[PDB]
């Protein structure tokens, strides 16, 4: 089980931090994934992180804006996000695949304004 939080309305420049808790005791062990959905358009692959977190990896439009991390003592997932725009409005989740599979009921993030 996963649920994110930190979701929240802001404005255009700013920021949020979004967490994703982990029920299972395996998440230390797993690659973890930030996706999102904006209004009528799929899932999209936002960021990865390896078990360990030495390896990190970002969506092009998120490179230099957003960072991914975990701490697995915690078993939480983060995601913090700066220079929201609004084509950034989505529900974002936490999942187990880069293709959003396991993901929790997700956190809106609405920027407008």
């Known amino acids: 089980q996963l649920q994110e939080s930190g979701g929240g309305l802001v404005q255009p420049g700013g920021s949020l931090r979004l967490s994703c808790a982990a029920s299972?005791?395996?998440?230390?062990?797993?690659?973890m994934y930030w996706v999102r959905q904006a209004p009528g358009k799929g899932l999209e692959w936002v960021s990865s992180?390896?078990?360990?977190?030495?390896?990190?990896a970002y969506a092009a439009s998120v490179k230099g804006r957003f960072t991914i991390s975990r701490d697995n003592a915690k078993n939480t997932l983060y995601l913090q996000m700066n220079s929201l725009k609004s084509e950034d409005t989505a529900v974002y989740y936490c999942?187990?695949?880069?293709?959003?599979?396991?993901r929790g009921q997700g956190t809106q993030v609405t920027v407008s304004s």
């Open positions: 999942s187990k695949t880069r293709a959003g599979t396991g």
């Open positions: 299972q005791f395996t998440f230390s062990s797993d690659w």
């Open positions: 992180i390896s078990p360990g977190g030495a390896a990190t």
